[PDB]
Each structure stands twice: as structure tokens, then as C-alpha cells.
Point group: D2
Chain length 219, copies 4
């Protein structure tokens, strides 16, 4: 069944974070995996889900302690997040969740990477000039083979960024996809909403959702 | 000691669902609590904590099995929510949560109850004509003596709303505040983000966050 | 027809700012006026005009010239807006405009005023209110969707004045309005400003604005 | 003067739609023009401007008289909009306005076009593109905030024509632009409409609108 798959990657991969499979999440998923739903509903529930994913993501960033006084003039053991960060989206598929990040991390810096296969290739790219100094949120909705994401982490490591400081924010991923990215580059963080059975004769996830970018942008 | 409080309420008030005490959660609460944070920042974060509130609360709603097929012609076992809802906000304080509810529940019906101290007393109220046949998301940021939330429930109950069908959405709650609601109306459901240590002479929650109402608005 | 009505008040009350009757505007209206359009669909087009209306209301404030330097290293002869302000809504009707105002004006102060006609006397009566402590120093955006008899709106303007706010510093942000309602407010307190999206022609036996939309409060919040 | 330039490109280019210079508009422009303001303030005011921009461009669409009945049980003589539409954002700079378009036109389809000057030749060239397969039978809201020399926007219109898009069902949505940038699009493609919010005086050696605002994208994504 489904449980078996989940449990295995959890036990076999410490740096991967699975969101709590709350009913309201299953629900959102069915609504987007279903091929019937209109384009209007797909982006809404997508967004509605993206956001819930980014929050469970910003939970991997380092935080320090910080005391504060309440209006009632009494202290509180609050916490705080320093660390400069930025968002990096894999062209089109990733741009999906950019808006979801700027909703919670105002005026956050956005970087773009166009990984095109004709071995995956690099095409266009604009990143923060100080990307090496910050923590990176790697945005890619679907993780099928992990070839473009593994090409993304590759261009990033060559530019400086520390592997231990990458946080792959994803929605759907295949077991073969998550174990390759973790074989190629351990020490990275992965946060997803769901992991499926396997790959298609082609390279699509099963059950899957289809082609995210196409369904998200209307093409 | 703030660890022991959550323990008593957890095992003696089974209907209370406390959000997961995460680093990011504490971080938001840290800033909303701080009396140093200005207008602009107070709401932005408050709006973000609320958003994760309305979500978590939505898992209290009943759902059924639903199947659909992905664009790969393989079926998927998901779920869906029926039984329509509505949102009742205790005027001014809970109105701050309306925008969050309608951000996950497009066009959901909204009700308003304005309870005033004379003994809390009803002053004005406009609920959906339907109401008595729906699930009710009761909005109220602060719950110190629970005096107002109780008056808000004895008024909904007088309108034919099923006790077990009332989900109380709260941000900050005081121990004595809980014991009151679950004593007068033991079948309601409560979802809070933070449970505090105690109230003071002016019946404010401490540490607390002050008067959520005018802090969210213009003092 | 409509153009003989819009022109008359334009001439008779130079203090009201009618919005530009565009195709997109006219289109929105008919969508929300249609007794058919479903709830979720009525609020979408609602909050979409609420925003276009507020953006038109912000040009009623005072501004000062402001020169800036651009990345090309040159100067720009710009302007800028000072003048503290705040929003004040008429409970359950204007509230539908808060969040809109809060969208172009991050964390703007919002005050509430619940007015109520009497069950017998049909008399505008104050029920509740919470305005900013210094509401007299700031400029005010009075929010209220409908304006038929203008009964409540004049009472709301009344409590504000008797609190230090300057009449000529009150700006009336409204969606719909009938000739009588805007003849009365401008007869009562002549210096306020009013920005409306549209002015119908008359009211019916129930004092409702006829081409109208019905009950903006119930239609927006559902209920 | 200024009223001189603007008056000219208004009378010799009937298809340009110069947003009404409201104070609040002058206000915003100022803030997004200050090399002094922070990232977050720039996006906030840019977005707010964009949304206003898009709401003006939608009126370049065709409507049709329609009646409806008011809850007061009486008719209203309104208008309605059909003619399906999509949005085509030139990669990066144009993307900024995307969310703005989806804020008013829910679920709308979006096609991207990544044009880029050549290594040595220095002329525009197509590199990547993903548009709606149906794009030939719909109106196109082309998204590009800047209109310098118009080399990129023209190379955009070109690919849309090669796909069967009518050059009159093309609404060019832009914020700030240069007179020679306008001159260029209205030479190659005279039937495309262009609604903009600002028209400066000239362009410099780097090909930047002189008063201008610098590198829009660079500043919008914070990659400078
Ligand atoms: O009409 P033109 O003469 O081409 O001038 C304006 C175009 O060029 C700029 O792109 P820029 O290279 O500054 O790159 P980026 O914004 O995508 O980073 C601008 O964003 C428009 O796309
Ligand atoms: O969008 C995509 C890309 C690859 N595989 C999928 O299932 N979806
Ligand atoms: O502490 C409290 C109690 C009630 N309402 C508030 O805003 N704060
Ligand atoms: O038509 C009318 C008149 C007053 N108030 C409303 O909500 N509608
Ligand atoms: O005006 C200009 C010139 C170059 N690049 C931009 O983004 N804008
Ligand atoms: Mg660009």
C-alpha cells in the first residue's frame, strides 16, 4: 500500500521531512491529482497547499533565543530566526511556489534556474550575488527522477552555497527520485507533501498529478 | 511549569487540540507578544498565525472517502469534505480571523456577535439564516475568563446549533479559560495556538499579548 | 436615462467624485447587481471594486512635492503623501472595505461605528464604537457601501465631528447611492468629500435603491 | 518640456494608453524610483501599481451589452466580457506583473517567452518558450514592465504572429517606456495596443530609460 512506501523513506532517509498526512491535506491532494477539476481550482488548492509547505519548510532554518517583554510588562522565552536566506526556483515548475514564499517571507530575494534536457543542461539563470552566504530554499514541485534538481544543486555548489544549507521544498516525489538526490548529495534537506509508488513508462509520477507547470499555468 | 499546564489540559480536556509547538510557531508568537512590534508588523504576523489556525481547525470537520483518477489513468484514493460551514466572529477581536478563514474558504458565510459587559450581554448579532444546520467556526483570539465565548455559545445553542458542531478557533488561552467552556459546553471542540500560565488582577492573560483587539486595529 | 442623473449631481455637488464609468467598471457592477451570481462570485467582484474605489479615494488627500534620486543618478520631480489617516466603517456594511483599505495602506488604523435605526421611531441611534485615540488629528475614510436615505451616514459623521475630526477632513467612500442620500449629506455637512462608483435614480416603497443591488451586507457576508 | 514629449507620442501613436497621472500614481512612481528604498517597499508599491495597470488594460477588450435582474426584481442594462485571453510574460521582468494579472483574472493562462540579445550580434533571439496551444484564438496581454529600445518586445510580438496571433488582439501592458521604444513597436506592428503608466524622455548608452528606475527585474527579485 501507501504506508509501506512512506515509512521506508522515513526510516532510510533522515534529512527528508514528510508533512503530517492530515485529512485536509489528502483532500487538497485529491482535488489537484484529479484530472477533472478546472484550472481555477487547481491553482487555488495548489497555492493553498504550497503555502502550507513553505511554513513547514521555514522550520528547518536555524533559530536563536530571544527574550521579550509583554505589554503586561512580563517576559517571555521567545525564539528568533536570523540567517540570510533566498528562494531559488527551477524555471516554470518552481515559479509556482515563488508567490507562496513572498507571502510569508516578504521582499525575499528570488533566484531562477532553467534546467533544460535536449544530460540535463543549464540555460538561463539569475541568482543573488551573495547566494553563497545564505541558506537556499530549492523550489521544485515534482521530483520524478531527480535529474534537474540534481543539476540545480550541482550548479549551486559550484557557485559556493553549502550543501548542508540547501532545503529542497517539494510537493510530489518518487522513491527513486528521493534516493538519487540523497545519494548524489546527502546533507541536504528535503520537505515534501507526498511520495508516490513509482515512475511511468515515461518519466511521470504514479499515481501522480500529471505535468504541474502545464496544469498550473494553463498549457 | 509551562510544560505541566499543557499536560493537565491535555489529559483532562481531550477535546482541546493544541497546534504543534514548532520553532516557527514560537517565532511568530514571540513577535506578536513583544510590545515593541509596530502596527504593520503586528498584523502581518498575526495574519500568518491565524492562517495556520483556520487550517488546523478545518481538520475537525467530517470527511468521506472519494476516488478520482490522475491524468495517467490510474486511480487515487482521496477524501473530501461536505457538511457546509460558516464562521461566527465575536465582534472586533474575532473579526481579525475572518480574512484568514475566507482565504482558505472562499465566500464561506460569515456571522457576527457583539457581546458587551453590562455580566456579558448580547448587543447585536447577524448570523446566517441557515446556521442551525451547519458546522460553526467560532472566532475569538483571546480566551481569558471565557465569559464572552460562553455567552456566544448559549446564543448559538438557543438558535438550534448542535453543541458538538462548534469548533472554537482561539489564539491564546488561559487554564481557567478552558475549564469554563468545557464545563458549560463539554461537547464543543477547541483549537488554540498557545496556552498560557495565568490571569492577573485585571483579568488579562499573562504573559499574554495584551489587548489583541486594539493592537490589531488602532489601539 | 442614467446620464441625465449622473450629470445633475456632478453639477449640483462639485464635492462628490464619481468614478470613471468604464467597461470594466460597468461590467463588475452588473455582475454584483445580478441577483443570480453566487455568493463566492459576488465577493470576488466586490473586493475587486472595493479596491478600485479606495485607490480613487486616496487622491483626495493632500500631497507635497518630493524630489528623488534614481539609480541612473538623476533627480525625479515627484510628490508624496503625508497626513496620517484612518478608516472608519459603519458596522457590518463598511467592514467589507477594511481589508481593501488595508491592502493599499499596510496596517492602517481602522475604527468601527455601529449605528442602529430604532424599532419604533426609526431613529438613527449609536450602539457601539471604537475609533483611534487621536482620530481628530487624522483624515478619515468613512466606509459604507450603500447610501439611500443617508440617515446612518449623517449620524456617523455627527459622532466624528463631536470628537474633533474636521468635516472637510472626512472622505466618504461609497459604492452605490441614490440622489436623495447625497443631497442630504451635502446639505447637512457641506465640506465632506464623497467618492462613489455609481448613483442610481430613486428608492422603492422599502427605501431600497432600486436599480440597486439589494442588501450589500447580507450579499457580501452571505448570512 | 515633459508635456511636450507625452503630447507628441499621444497624437502620433493613437494606440498608446497613457494611464491617468493621478497624484497617487505620481506618488507610487516616486517611491519605486528611489534608489534609496528597500526591496520589500519596492515590491509592495510595484505590485500595487501593476494591479492598477492591468485593470486599465482589461478595458482594451471587447464587451457586449447584457441585462440582468436585481434582487429588487428589476432589470439592469450592463455589459459583459468574453473573448478568451491569456498572458505572455517575457522571462523575469514580465513575470513580476503575472500575479497581478491573476489577482483580477483568476485561473488565467500564462505563457512565458525568454528572449535574449546575442553574444556578439547583440540582436534579440528566442531561447525558451511555453505558450497556450490555443493562443491563436485568444487575446494576448503581453507583459513587460520596460520598453527601452523595444528589441525584446518586438522579438516577442514576432513569435506570437508566427503562431497565428492577430496583431490587434495584442495588448502590450507596460509601466515605464522610452519614446524610441514606442516608435519601434508602432513601426513594425501598428495594430498592437499599448497601455503604459509612464513615458520618460530618453535612453542612455547602457540602454536604460534615463530618469527611469534602473533594472526593474534586478530590483524586483533582489538579484543586484
Ligand atoms: O525593450 P528593450 O530595449 O529590450 O528594453 C527593456 C527590456 O530589457 C530589460 O531586461 P534586463 O536585461 O535588464 O534583464 P532581467 O530584467 O530579466 O534581469 C527589461 O526588463 C525589458 O525586458
Ligand atoms: O511536471 C512534472 C515533471 C515530471 N514528472 C511529473 O510527474 N510531473
Ligand atoms: O487578555 C485579554 C483578555 C481579553 N481580551 C484581550 O484582548 N486580552
Ligand atoms: O438598497 C439598500 C439601501 C440601504 N442599505 C442596503 O444595504 N441596501
Ligand atoms: O529601462 C531599463 C533598461 C534596462 N533594463 C531594465 O530593466 N530597464
Ligand atoms: Mg528581464
Amino acid at each position: 500500500q501507501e504506508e509501506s512506501i512512506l515509512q521506508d523513506i522515513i526510516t532510510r532517509f533522515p534529512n527528508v521531512v514528510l508533512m503530517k498526512q492530515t485529512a485536509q491535506l489528502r483532500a487538497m491532494m485529491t482535488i489537484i491529482r484529479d484530472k477533472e477539476t478546472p484550472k481555477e481550482e487547481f491553482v487555488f488548492y495548489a497555492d493553498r497547499l504550497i503555502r502550507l509547505l513553505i511554513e513547514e519548510a521555514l522550520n528547518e532554518l536555524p533559530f536563536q533565543k530571544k527574550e521579550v517583554t509583554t505589554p503586561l510588562d512580563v517576559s517571555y522565552h521567545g525564539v528568533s530566526f536570523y540567517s540570510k536566506i533566498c528562494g531559488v526556483s527551477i524555471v516554470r515548475a518552481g515559479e509556482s511556489m515563488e508567490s507562496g514564499l513572498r507571502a510569508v517571507c516578504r521582499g525575499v530575494r528570488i533566484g531562477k534556474i532553467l534546467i533544460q534536457r535536449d544530460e540535463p543542461k543549464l540555460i538561463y539563470e539569475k541568482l543573488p550575488a551573495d547566494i553563497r552566504e545564505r541558506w537556499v530554499m530549492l523550489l521544485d514541485p515534482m521530483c520524478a527522477t531527480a535529474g534537474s534538481v540534481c543539476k540545480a544543486i550541482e550548479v549551486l555548489l559550484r557557485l559556493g552555497v553549502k550543501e548542508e544549507r540547501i532545503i529542497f521544498v517539494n510537493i510530489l516525489a518518487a522513491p527513486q527520485g528521493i534516493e538519487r538526490v540523497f545519494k548524489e548529495y546527502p546533507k541536504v534537506r528535503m520537505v515534501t507533501a507526498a511520495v508516490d509508488i513509482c515512475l511511468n513508462s515515461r518519466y511521470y509520477i504514479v499515481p501522480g498529478i500529471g505535468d504541474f507547470g502545464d496544469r498550473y499555468f494553463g498549457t
